[PDB]
Design a protein around this nucleic acid. Structure first.
Length: 213
DNA sequence: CTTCGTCACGGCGGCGAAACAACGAGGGGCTTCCACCGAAACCGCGCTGCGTTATAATGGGAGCTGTCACGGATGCA
């Protein structure tokens, strides 16, 4: 009753997951391509092969992730390869290549079968990449909107420039930037006289966010 | 083509940490025994030396000896 779409170059679903033939779910196969995500129709779940290669499997799990709406993404890895399997893959469920038929059935029937938190005086709207600080208008540049976003949810957490750099930027990451200094100085300006006490900037500890009061 | 985002550039400055000098409690400087080294001793005894042996016994075993020549030093006649 589920259409499972395999992105695997094995040309058969059998060595990727052996016991799946014991369940009468339909399996539609294609090589591990992003364009075969356009090959998804009424697929209820999707399995990626990452048994020997954790990197492209994790990135494909990432390629699916955050796109929306979304159909939940699954992957199959090895047991010594479960070290890299984490929440950073964008997984909803991970499968091993030795999980049983009723086990895969239960994981599938679990996974295929609200608003933002208010409020730290900085609302986050995901549409135009902008916020709202005690006032409707709040212009945030491409990276001056996520810098506040990064310090928003991790309020109270201490983050160094590089720790911020690789999540706030791509990052590349360049050096000798002061881009944090350029931003936080700018992010402490468009926030008006009030809420200047939203970021904790003590010397050489990085740039932590201080939540009220 | 237009207009916005980013990323150094350079300084500013206020924190900040490390160097330098008022010194007092763990070492340096005290006795106080006796298992001990170490002495001093008290030995005996392998180890070397030295003595004696009482029928008669009364002359080496051995060695295999040659060159080639030559000056000369040495016993004869």
């Amino acid at each position: 009753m589920l259409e499972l779409l395999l992105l695997t170059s094995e040309l058969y679903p059998d060595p990727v997951l052996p016991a799946l033939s014991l369940l009468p779910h339909t399996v539609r196969t294609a090589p591990a391509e992003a364009s075969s995500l356009l090959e998804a129709g009424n697929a209820d779940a999707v399995l990626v092969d990452a048994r020997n290669d954790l990197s492209s499997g994790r990135g494909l799990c990432r390629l699916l992730s955050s796109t929306g709406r979304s159909i939940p993404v699954l992957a199959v890895v090895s047991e010594g390869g479960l070290v890299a399997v984490s929440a950073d893959w964008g997984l909803d469920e991970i499968l091993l290549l030795s999980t049983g038929p009723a086990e895969i059935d239960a994981r599938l029937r679990l996974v295929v079968g609200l608003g933002k938190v208010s409020l730290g005086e900085l609302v986050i709207d995901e549409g135009t990449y902008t916020a709202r600080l005690r006032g409707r208008p709040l212009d945030l540049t491409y990276k001056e909107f996520e810098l506040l976003k990064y310090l928003a949810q991790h309020a109270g957490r201490v983050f160094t420039r590089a720790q911020l750099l690789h999540e706030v930027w791509g990052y590349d990451f360049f050096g000798g930037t002061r881009t944090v200094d350029v931003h936080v100085r700018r992010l402490r300006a468009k926030l008006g006289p009030e809420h200047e006490a939203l970021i904790g900037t003590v010397r050489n500890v990085g740039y932590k966010a201080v939540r009220p009061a």
